[PDB]
Design a protein around this ligand. Structure first.
Ligand SMILES: Nc1ncnc2c1ncn2[C@@H]1O[C@H](COP(=O)(O)OP(=O)(O)OC[C@H]2O[C@H](O)[C@H](O)[C@@H]2O)[C@@H](O)[C@H]1O
Ligand SMILES: Nc1ncnc2c1ncn2[C@@H]1O[C@H](COP(=O)(O)OP(=O)(O)OC[C@H]2O[C@H](O)[C@H](O)[C@@H]2O)[C@@H](O)[C@H]1O
Ligand SMILES: Nc1ncnc2c1ncn2[C@@H]1O[C@H](COP(=O)(O)OP(=O)(O)O)[C@@H](O)[C@H]1O
Ligand SMILES: Nc1ncnc2c1ncn2[C@@H]1O[C@H](COP(=O)(O)OP(=O)(O)O)[C@@H](O)[C@H]1O
Ligand SMILES: [Mg+2]
Ligand SMILES: [Mg+2]
Lengths: 398, 96, 185, 185, 400
């Protein structure tokens, strides 16, 4: 179930090999949408499955009249969502600037329904999205373990971990605001928070193990563009009070240049400056010597990411580890011919005689909860929590 | 081909040791058991006798004609194994 | 697109004082590790093996000392042999009268080179007996020749409760399995 | 509130000259005494135990020398073994060729880590006899296995005019109570 | 047939000797027209047969009237072509200056016929001369090996190898522009190239803290070198040259410009062209007189007076070593034992019989060809002798 260069590995050798990669000069993680189903997320298949059932009348119009989506993928549930949203936004903008009243009202309903469907699944908690201290719940038990394991394994004088993700939910921020760790995500300020691309070059020092970096490749729920041509960030409560309540409990969609998720409104020269910078920073990271990368929860359905990853293996000091649950079905389907682009890409990647590539298979042995268990603790890390008792006693004093 | 055996090589001629090739030795803790080994070998190496006194269980040191250079070997278990064990005195005294 | 070596360097030689080689350490090494096309190797633990490249030979050495002097690090090593390329592969020779030159680069040796040193004739591989694996790395197999064991002298020793009878049985059984007909008392 | 270690260090390694280690101590009272959740600890004289953190293992060493060179102080130590996690606790191994890297911090050994070094192999606990307590720290108990003790020759030594009668009587009293079935001719 | 000072040696000793000579302070290689015959080229005596078969009429009017070539050599194929071209150019220039219409008309018909035969045998790929990426074919497999082997044997802080050649084709540049090496040949610029002799003293260096380069001297010129109306020497690309003048020379039958081309050693009477030729000879002479020089020779027929003179005089130095390849030793010895053969045979034989441990001569027919010359050179232990990038590149190209 574990392959490295064509042959097979066992549990002990794999566990020993993983520990050696965590001590390189540069370490990083790339997570997808499959890493949030353990806390309340939904896979891209379920979003389409629900949208198709809920809004049948628009489905025929999308397939027959405007030629935005085909029929085989709709019947197989293999439809990319963000590309469709970008195309719909482009169509709406063209119709608005051409002054065609008939088509202007046709795309508003489609965009509103799509945004209602995608947003309602991104609230990992639900109605308690507004409240504070959402990192103390049991659902986020493993993100803290991941962050602690990544941070505690760095010697003094070395760099800091870098985390890339393709989600637009607030799981990592909630987890990292409970440990006592600060993450740099490019924004600064409180009363007016703006985007400064040079903030990815700073660090803290003590004048008498605090920080990490977080890159989001698809935006976030708390980012929006106001009347001025600038990008702003707000807290969860303010965003809910401002524009998230109306999306879910109203037929409200007025501004097409407002939201910055997911990968939408890219034709504006002010909004694409964020996606381009994030993608450039991702591309530059894996070009450094003595680098490692762990991939989990990502379905290989993007051309540019695959192109960048495959072209980065020319250097003799780049190592990658891939987790893929449904591996045997891919092999069987590729053997008889056919198969999607993801299956072909991952099968071709597996069959090379390279010692720099490792692929892990299995049904439940490749999930996110199992990826965390492989990373090791240090010997001297304090594990027994003996602080909550004192907090309880203080609260009981009253 | 012969096999000369001595765990106390001090009371023996070094020519017995210098005119021979192969040897095997596990952990052995005694300071006066290495004088012949110290003298017999020609000049060129003397620092490799220190670690023979701390080998853990299952490790051995072998060197001779059959090997190009001295090497430290971890010996695998032989299956089927040797005799189980000696007598156990727990059952005899269980009469109490 | 031209790369002279596929493996990165670590240090360079600055002084020879007989058979004691002095090497200064670079700054690019930070996490006592180095990665290449086959895996990750460590060099910062005294008692391991290193190598020096000089033309058509590779000088194999053994680390003895390590210490500090701007933080500077130095390493002392002794040479034990060299590696040669003859027809299409490699062979190891056992003379240590050859020494490197000043300015030579220092590079760790991978498992491919380690296999050659603790190896014997390929023709004897069907005629060999397996004993165990390497102790320091546990990545190399060890084989012995039965014919040469009974040509020169051999001896066995050992303490109590450490595996003397285990080795005796393991060695005796394989000879019978390979050569059922022999004269041994 | 987020802490990587709850035990303060004392120094760092500045050399490995074969089997010895060099340590540079901190200034003030930081390099002699420490404090933690379970009590107090100190390293004062040769004959104590010190530990070196090495990531996934923990090396154990014994102090040999202390001297000057405000002045500066340094220590020389020898290695014994290491400690590692197994399932939910720890275990002690007795291999003495593993050494730490330069710059690694030095910490004293708490009673929690002292219990592990002087324990039995997790399976003879119900069949263990209590004899006494260690001398240097008088905080850790000592247990022995019944089957391992009374299975071969056992010897008790001493000197005339020193308690051979007394020590013999006391030890055979405390050892041979529950199972007198052994033979003393 | 490996004679060192007159005494034969076996293979292993010769291999050890050649391994020892590759680690001196200075190294260099001298080639000739025989090293490019394996790619599609030809030799000097092969061109004369084609010329005197294709134009038998000019041979009658070139020997009797102007006395340019002897009758004995024409029937034996021992003529020097590029030396005849210089005389033809001198005759044409004198006739033009003196204003003799008949002689000017007569000589213009001969130079075109000579340049057509000289050029047509040097394109080395036929019509596919103006295309790009010509180093990816299997014909230039050994030039790359030679270049790679020469560079990789140098320790840090040592001089780079130098390569001389009497050829005027583009094999070495095509081979080098594929590995990723840059060669210094005395030219600079992109839009207007020019000849700067002082750049031979430059080198590259990394500013971060690569240094992989070599020098190429062309002693007889090149196809892509021409002089415009001004007093400057320019260099162009292969495609630009083909579109400019090579196509007209090959195809048209009544085309001739004049004092335009700088190959092979044609217009030496001018004081702006000979300046290019003199520098190469001067630098060859300066390099060869270094304290620790070791020079290799291959593909050279020893038919030149000046090169032989400079080689012989350079041996009055106790640290100069030469290696000669000449696969015709037996016939030369037999022809010189009776009464003496040609000048080249006499020179090579009187070079072989001396009692010196520096000179070395190798023979044996196909045993001393250019292809077999490469394998005698050493090969580093740590050099990556594999091919791994091709699979990744083809996999990348497969996507989309
Ligand atoms: N519990 C689990 N743990 C880990 N992986 C899981 C789990 N459950 C399912 N999976 C696997 O998780 C994977 C779900 O794949 P998808 O959610 O379609 O991938 P993406 O959304 O990251 O696609 C990346 C983006 O790029 C493109 O633009 C796309 O449009 C996206 O926006 C499958 O392998 C599941 O088996
Ligand atoms: N495959 C081969 N490999 C090696 N040598 C070969 C091969 N084939 C033939 N040879 C030999 O290679 C040699 C080629 O003979 P030529 O081309 O006439 O001699 P050059 O290149 O020195 O003449 C050109 C220059 O030399 C003079 O100074 C002229 O004035 C020019 O400046 C012969 O020994 C062939 O047998
Ligand atoms: N290769 C090995 N690895 C681990 N334990 C071993 C090995 N060989 C032998 N033993 C242990 O040694 C015990 C037998 O010891 P024995 O060989 O009788 O001691 P001696 O060699 O002193 O006669 C067995 O119980 C077995 O557990
Ligand atoms: N119950 C006890 N408490 C304290 N000390 C004791 C006890 N029993 C014996 N000792 C000490 O042990 C020592 C035994 O020495 P002794 O028996 O006189 O030596 P020997 O028998 O060789 O002459 C005595 O000095 C005595 O003080
Ligand atoms: Mg025994
Ligand atoms: Mg007494």
């Amino acid at each position: 179930s574990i392959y490295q260069g064509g042959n097979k590995l066992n549990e002990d050798d794999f566990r020993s090999h993983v520990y050696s990669l965590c001590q390189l000069d540069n370490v990083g993680v790339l997570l997808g949408a499959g890493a949030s189903v353990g806390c309340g997320g939904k896979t891209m298949k379920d979003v389409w499955k629900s949208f198709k059932q809920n809004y049948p009348e628009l489905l025929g119009a999308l397939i027959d009249k405007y030629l935005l989506v085909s029929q085989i993928d709709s019947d197989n549930n293999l439809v990319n969502v963000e590309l469709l949203i970008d195309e719909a936004t482009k169509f709406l903008s063209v119709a608005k600037t051409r002054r065609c009243e008939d088509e202007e009202e046709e795309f508003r309903k489609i965009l509103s329904s799509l945004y209602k469907e995608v947003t309602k699944a991104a609230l990992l908690t639900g109605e308690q999205f507004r409240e504070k201290n959402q990192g103390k719940k049991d659902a986020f038990k493993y993100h803290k373990e991941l962050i602690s394991k990544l941070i505690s394994n760095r010697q003094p004088g070395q760099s800091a971990p870098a985390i890339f993700t393709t989600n637009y939910d607030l799981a990592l921020e909630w987890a990292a605001e409970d440990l006592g760790i600060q993450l740099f995500n490019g924004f600064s300020g409180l009363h007016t928070r703006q985007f400064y691309p040079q903030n990815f070059d700073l660090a803290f020092r003590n004048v008498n193990h605090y920080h990490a970096y977080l890159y989001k490749l698809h935006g976030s729920l708390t980012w929006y563009q106001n009347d001025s041509l600038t990008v702003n960030e707000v807290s969860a409560s303010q965003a809910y009070d401002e524009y998230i309540n109306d999306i879910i409990n109203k037929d409200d969609f007025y501004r097409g240049q407002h939201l910055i998720y997911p990968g939408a409104n890219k034709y504006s020269h002010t909004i694409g400056f964020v996606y381009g910078e994030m993608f450039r920073r991702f591309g530059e990271f894996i070009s450094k010597p003595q680098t490692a990368l762990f991939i989990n929860g990502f379905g290989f359905g993007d051309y540019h990411i695959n192109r960048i990853i495959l072209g980065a293996l020319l250097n003799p000091s780049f190592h990658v580890v891939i987790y893929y649950p449904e591996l045997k079905e891919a092999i069987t389907k590729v053997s008889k011919g056919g198969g999607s682009e993801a299956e072909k890409a991952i099968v071709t990647l597996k069959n090379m005689a390279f010692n720099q590539v490792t692929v892990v298979g299995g049904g439940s042995k490749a999930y996110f909860n199992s990826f965390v268990e492989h990373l090791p603790y240090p010997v001297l890390f304090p594990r027994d929590n003996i602080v909550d008792e004192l907090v309880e006693a203080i609260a009981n004093l009253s | 081909s012969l096999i000369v055996s001595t765990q106390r090589p001090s009371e023996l001629s070094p020519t017995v040791l210098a005119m021979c090739s192969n040897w095997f030795s596990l952990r052995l803790t005694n300071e006066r058991d290495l004088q012949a080994l110290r003298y017999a070998m020609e000049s060129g190496n003397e620092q490799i006798l220190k670690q023979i006194s701390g080998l853990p269980r299952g490790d051995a040191v072998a060197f001779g004609s059959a090997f190009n250079l001295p090497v430290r070997i971890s010996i695998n278990q032989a299956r089927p194994g040797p005799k189980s064990s000696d007598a156990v005195f727990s059952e005899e005294w269980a009469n109490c | 697109l031209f790369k002279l070596t596929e493996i990165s360097a670590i240090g360079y030689v600055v002084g020879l004082e007989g058979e004691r080689i002095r090497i200064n350490l670079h700054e690019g090494l930070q996490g006592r590790l180095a990665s290449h096309r086959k895996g990750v190797s460590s060099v910062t633990q005294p008692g391991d093996l290193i190598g020096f490249d000089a033309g058509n030979i590779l000088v194999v050495a053994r680390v003895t000392d390590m210490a500090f002097v701007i933080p500077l690090r130095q390493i002392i090593a002794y040479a034990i042999g060299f590696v040669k390329r003859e027809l299409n592969g490699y062979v190891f020779i056992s003379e240590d009268w050859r020494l490197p030159a000043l300015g030579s680069s220092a590079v760790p040796l991978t498992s491919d080179f380690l296999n050659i040193i603790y190896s014997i004739d390929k023709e004897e591989l069907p005629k060999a007996v397996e004993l165990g694996v390497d102790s320091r790395t546990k990545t190399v197999k060890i084989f012995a020749s039965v014919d040469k064991l009974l040509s020169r002298h051999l001896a066995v020793l050992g303490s109590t409760g450490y595996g003397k009878s285990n080795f005796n049985a393991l060695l005796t059984r394989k000879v019978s399995e390979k050569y059922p007909n022999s004269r041994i008392v």
